[PDB]
């Protein structure tokens, strides 16, 4: 039964000329579809509509080619061709009884315009702090009028495309906020200086947009009410509440964020630094002055926390981005009282990393169907049922083997899942114990819960933990029709790394003064005072180990041959991670790698130490002057973070005996997850989901084709257009 | 007329079953189109076919989704959709009598598969040294047979698509090279160990592809004959030549490069480091052993250098990528003896920088129609002719103003171009005087030459240099119908920068101990011994000034608030630039910026010195602990490289008197290039090209729409497919 206290989340609420059916609201978020992948855009949003979300929004939607985010992918509403592509989404969302919203965007200099080559315009000329080679033209009064007109023409196309909700977007330090914020706005005319003057651009845009479409569409606005930068950008109790009072009469609904664009991880709070509800102290300030409905995101996954912010009067509506990606059916699950089916977001920001890299589609660590709904036909809650009695043995219960188990049981198969480990979750169990990573637990907590539930409904299925390791003969004599090897990866013990692909002389994790991540996380092997971490990985392991050891009292130096924490730029974790290492006194030596190791010392070299001039010097000889930067540094312990290898011994043994499978009635054995190749957790989860989805295909080791959303030559994007080459001569 | 010694370049040569009409060959190169923008792909290659190139190749062309380069854009030949898209290019290239070629690609772990999410396969499992989070599965024998079959199926699709030339691609350390090269290949079976074994994968692939399509298509191979890394990878006189001998009977034509993928600026050599012909010492080693036609790229633009390598017997064919982008008509121009019309590539690698960023279309510093042929209808050598006698005044002869003059004169307009400078070229004249950048001067040399010749045939046009600066009154009284303002930008003199968008206290380049780039390049202002460069720019200025200053004997420290030379990662200059700074003893302080300057000293701070934990602390205060890393450093001279600002005073004065334009018979005044917003040189050039092409449009200040190559919802990419959402249930 639904807890009756949760009934309030299912009450409707008026927003201008529209009604939201409940309090679950998907705020605008990127997915890597834009107006470019209309199947993905429409499936991803309409699965959530079917899942019960009251309103579904596009990501940021450019109003004109001079706000082109290429190389990143935004939605666009430039012309009739975009109207058609985006209407595929509004039509589909409407079929499930939800509203659709579009977030009208203009970036100023933050949009680098790499496709359009156009010049962005802004309140003053500046080079973007985020796109540092991108500059804008300072607007004159006619520029201001013409960009306001872009907004009006876009709002009109938006109504043509079937949208119910139209935003003017002034969060993440985009144009309306640029004019509001003296960090950007240095004008001394009537659009700069006092708050009334600084607000003028956004207020006139709202008035013009509302005048164009507002009796048909709700006019929303998204506002970074505090830049979380201190004085000198926007402060909630200085300009923020006061802007709200100025704009309140024009806005049908407030959508509130904090932070800027360069560090928008302050908005999309990674769980490493921020808990559910972290934005409350700023967001709550808006309902203190607004007489309109208000939401403000804060990684809300828990209906207990949701009813708290509503009954205490801090927000009227529950806005979510990530939680809707991890679980498009979150609302229906709360409505039906299926709390234990809720697939809770871990705030890892892998979904965001995709968009930040610029171009790739979204993926999600929890939800292997995000991005897959359209092109592979994978609905998160509906699985093809087996028509046979086949059984599957799965060796290994980390993200990949556990997801395979969950999906195969959902599809009706008999599944035996086994692991030496005491509990489900494989390498994630030690990872989630790293400083800050505690919520990454939820990935294996969800799978433990679901697998336990699923066992009750197939009676032949089985979960066996803390078992002896499976051997090739155990597998061969197990009795399963098909077998999945999901045995994971381990960190290298011998210095092998992506720069040289070879061991490092003297590297050996069995020695008393060297350790792998696993040995560090296990916490039995002694670690001395001075610790060097030798790093050839660009994600979280080395910085997380550095933080762990430094908080535990060690003097830590990281020697990195690749850009330290580079992938954390994309998950937005990097700025706070670097501040954390700095507070903790961790020393960083970038651009160095290690050519050999001995007890208590290691030799390092600057990676740019070879001569700059290449000549042909013949065979057997380097074409550059020799690198003479080598020097010795000391340590008491050396932690090797140099890369990973697949644990695929068992697979190798079974394959060498493939001639024996048929006589043992084994029809197939497949290799997934880290054991095939070291993957992101999201991608290991994906491989388990995919093999389970395709377990009946000719070769389940290899994905079948997905639908591609690429133009077909001979079909013009513009309706009635001419697709042929035409020179202007 | 053509020099008779160039006649050799126009002799045909047989390659297997096909005939090249001349010795001008466009090797495979990225353009940002692949099979996804079939308009762009077909227009870009077919203009060159019209321009006399004997063969035009697609870029690297994936044979299967488990070699997907997303976020970077490759061609693809995975299915019938791609066959239709690429056939637009083969049909268009054939219309002009050239051969069309495709480059069959499989990247191993170098392809990060961010769209497909499939697992790449390789000779041994490694993490790519270029994509450092991307790992492959080690190939067993069936894997090898399967990937070989992918090449075969792609080659059959290629013949369907109408290609004449099919490559097995084994350069830039892609898969055939990975099996060849013990840096990657650690196998101990019959595909590893000896040369014969290491070559077996590439040899079998060639035999299979030749078998499938060889009667119909020339089989070419691209080979990184030396990795330029010394022993430990491929060396030309060790494995290189011996491999050519083993494969010679299978290959119709050799296409030779040097270098790997992580540092492929050794192949696409930047003029900063490499002259025309820089590859000859390695390339000529192939004809020492091969009996087949051979080419090897080397930034060839001069026909004198071209006949040298053919008459000496070092190559049979002139392969080009960049020269063909700068001038699609280079071969016709040589054929007709129009040497002074040749637009010579400057080796800036801005074209490549787009590809490297991942996703955007190619652009070109010399050729402002690259990427624009299809979507704007801009042919590089055909100009719509004016039908009126309108005159245009152009103030400033830098890359934008001189491009605008050139195009307007080619279009039949009367133009008067004026500048205070003694020579055409604007800010490029000092830029090209920086260490290594002398070849960048070709951009202005081309325009100086072209403008001089256009004046001889456009008799009412005029060039005036060494002029007094134009004032607003001079412009208003000048007598032109239209005016273009192209007055450029300057480096900031008060510390204004992209981090704070404000001046720095104490910054002022009028002080004797502080200098701008222009003051350094001018050479008059004295510079002291200890130099600090303060940098907030990510491209070439700060590194290039550091080189110049350290080579002149100064002790140089670079304090950089942004990632130093970040943009040079994309131009492939970064690795030799860092080696150059290291060998000159230039010190770098990354992650710091500057809070105030005084005579001989400046206060710097660590950019990550703020506390890592954000909390609500109310207005007037930072949400984090204070940054306490501030410290002073001394200098004798401080070079300010903090950002640029438009020089738009003349513009602002004319706009302030817009009410007088009609009295003075001025129909419009437009603002282009760096004076509208500081741009890359390629983009400043584009703005002048654009306004010239669009001088008759309603508002030439703003680009008209271009044709968009994005899918139309309702049309499936696969012929006969179903575009509608369908779930697998
Ligand atoms: C993209 C990505 C994938 C994320 C998760 C957030 C996001 C994305 N793109 C956005 C955009 O197009 N416009 C916009 O206004 N906001 C965008 N976001 C931020 C998102 O809307 C939320 O503000 C944050 O994710 C925090 O909310 P929550 O995920 O904790 O609920
Ligand atoms: C992309 C880019 C834009 C550049 C100019 C070169 C290039 C690109 N992509 C390539 C790819 O798809 N396959 C391939 O084999 N080579 C590719 N290239 C390298 C190019 O082919 C030449 O080897 C170099 O540019 C050197 O030749 P040149 O430009 O000096 O004539
Ligand atoms: N022979 C084996 N028998 C049983 N379990 C195994 C065996 N080999 C490895 N495992 C288990 O396989 C799991 C792989 O999990 P993990 O490393 O998280 O991989 P992934 O991320 O691919 O899911 C580990 O929990 C490990 O205990
Ligand atoms: N008032 C003026 N009258 C004539 N020329 C000017 C005036 N102001 C600036 N210039 C010239 O304009 C040119 C601008 O060139 P440049 O800086 O290279 O801009 P861009 O990169 O946009 O082409 C310089 O050569 C400069 O001398
Ligand atoms: S990738 Fe991590 S963050 Fe993003 S929605 Fe999924 S799960 Fe939450
Ligand atoms: S961008 Fe530069 S290197 Fe590339 S083709 Fe054009 S002029 Fe040559």
Swiss-Prot record, chains A, B:
Signal peptide: none annotated. FMN binds at residues 28, 30, 60, 103, 222, 267, 299, 321-322. [4Fe-4S] cluster binds at residues 345, 348, 351, 364. It comes from the Bacteria. Its cofactor is FMN; [4Fe-4S] cluster. It catalyses: trimethylamine + oxidized [electron-transfer flavoprotein] + H2O + H(+) = dimethylamine + reduced [electron-transfer flavoprotein] + formaldehyde. It holds the Pfam family OYE-like_second_a-b. Binds 1 FMN covalently per subunit. InterPro entries: Aldolase_TIM, FAD/NAD-bd_sf, NADH:flavin_oxidoreductase, OxRdtase_FMN_N, TMADH/DMDH/HD_second_a-b, TMADH/DMDH_FMN-bd. Keywords: 4Fe-4S, Flavoprotein, FMN, Iron, Iron-sulfur, Metal-binding, Oxidoreductase. In the N-terminal section; belongs to the NADH:flavin oxidoreductase/NADH oxidase family. PANTHER family: 2,4-DIENOYL-COA REDUCTASE (PTHR42917), 2,4-DIENOYL-COA REDUCTASE [(2E)-ENOYL-COA-PRODUCING] (PTHR42917:SF2). This is Trimethylamine dehydrogenase. It comes from Methylophilus methylotrophus.
């Amino acid at each position: 039964a639904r807890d009756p206290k949760h009934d309030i989340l299912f009450e409707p609420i008026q927003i201008g000329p529209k009604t939201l059916r409940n309090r679950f609201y998907q705020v605008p978020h990127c997915i890597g579809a834009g107006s470019d992948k209309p199947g993905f855009q429409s499936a991803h949003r309409s699965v959530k509509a079917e899942g019960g979300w009251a309103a579904l929004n596009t990501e940021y939607c450019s109003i004109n080619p001079e706000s082109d985010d290429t190389h990143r992918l935004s939605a666009r509403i430039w012309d009739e061709g975009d109207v058609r592509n985006l209407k595929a989404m509004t039509d589909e969302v409407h079929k499930y009884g939800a509203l659709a919203g579009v977030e009208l965007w203009y970036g100023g200099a933050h949009a680098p315009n790499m496709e359009s080559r156009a010049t962005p315009r802004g309140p003053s000329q500046y080079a973007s702090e985020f796109e540092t080679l991108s500059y804008c033209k300072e607007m004159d009064l006619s520029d201001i009028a013409q960009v306001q007109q872009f907004y009006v023409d876009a709002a009109k196309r938006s109504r043509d495309a079937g949208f119910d909700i139209v935003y003017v977007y002034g969060a993440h330090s985009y144009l309306p906020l640029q004019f509001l914020n003296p960090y950007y706005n240095k004008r001394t005319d009537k659009y700069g200086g006092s708050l009334e003057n600084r607000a003028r651009f956004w207020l006139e845009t709202l008035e013009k947009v509302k005048h164009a479409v507002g009796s048909d569409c709700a006019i929303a606005t998204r506002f970074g009410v505090d830049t979380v930068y201190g004085p000198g950008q926007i402060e909630a109790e200085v300009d923020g509440q006061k802007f709200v009072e100025m704009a309140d009469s024009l806005v049908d609904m407030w959508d509130i964020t904090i932070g800027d664009i360069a560090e928008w991880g302050e908005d999309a709070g990674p769980s490493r630094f921020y808990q559910q509800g972290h934005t409350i102290p700023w967001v709550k300030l808006v309902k203190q002055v607004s007489k309109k409905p208000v939401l403000g995101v804060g990684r809300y996954t828990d209906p207990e926390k949701m009813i708290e912010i509503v009954t205490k009067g801090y927000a009227d509506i529950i806005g979510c981005a990530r939680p809707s990606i991890a679980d498009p059916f979150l609302p229906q699950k709360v409505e039906q009282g299926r709390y234990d089916d809720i697939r809770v977001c871990i705030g890892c920001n892998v979904c965001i990393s995709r968009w930040e890299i610029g171009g790739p589609p979204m993926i999600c660590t929890q939800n292997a169907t995000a991005g897959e709904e359209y092109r592979r036909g994978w609905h998160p809650e509906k699985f093809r049922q087996t028509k046979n009695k086949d059984s599957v043995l799965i060796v290994g219960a980390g993200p990949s083997g556990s997801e395979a188990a969950r999906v195969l049981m959902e599809s009706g198969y008999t599944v035996h899942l086994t692991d030496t480990a005491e509990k489900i979750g494989g390498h994630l169990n030690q990872v989630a114990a790293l400083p800050g990573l505690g919520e990454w637990s939820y990935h294996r907590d969800y799978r433990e819960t679901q697998i336990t539930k699923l066992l009750k409904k197939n009676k032949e299925s089985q979960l066996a933990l803390g078992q002896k390791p499976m051997t090739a003969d155990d597998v061969l004599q197990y009795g399963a029709d098909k077998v999945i090897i999901a045995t994971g990866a381990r960190w290298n013990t011998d210095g092998t790394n992506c720069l040289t692909h070879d061991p490092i002389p003297g590297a050996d994790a069995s020695l008393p003064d060297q350790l792998t991540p696993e040995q560090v996380m296990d916490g039995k092997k002694k670690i001395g005072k001075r610790v060097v971490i030798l790093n050839a990985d660009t994600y979280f392991m080395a910085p997380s180990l550095a933080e762990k050891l430094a908080t535990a009292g060690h003097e830590v130096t990281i020697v990195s041959g690749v850009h330290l924490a580079n992938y954390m730029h994309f998950t937005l974790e990097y700025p706070n991670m670097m501040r954390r290492l700095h507070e903790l006194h961790v020393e960083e030596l970038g651009d160095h790698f290690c050519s050999r190791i001995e007890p208590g010392r290691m030799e390092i070299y600057n990676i740019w130490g070879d001569g700059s001039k290449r000549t042909y010097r013949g065979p057997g000889v380097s074409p550059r002057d020799a690198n003479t930067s080598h020097r010795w540094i000391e340590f008491d312990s050396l932690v090797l973070v140099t890369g990973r290898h697949s644990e695929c011994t068992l697979w190798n043994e079974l394959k060498a005996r493939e001639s024996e499978w048929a006589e043992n009635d084994i029809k197939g054995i497949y290799l997934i997850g880290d054991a095939e190749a070291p993957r992101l957790i999201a991608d290991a989860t994906f491989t388990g989901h995919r093999v389970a989805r395709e377990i009946e295909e000719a070769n389940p080791q290899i994905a079948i084709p997905y639908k591609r959303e690429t133009i077909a030559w001979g079909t013009p994007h513009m309706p009635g257009g001419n697709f042929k080459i035409e020179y202007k001569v």
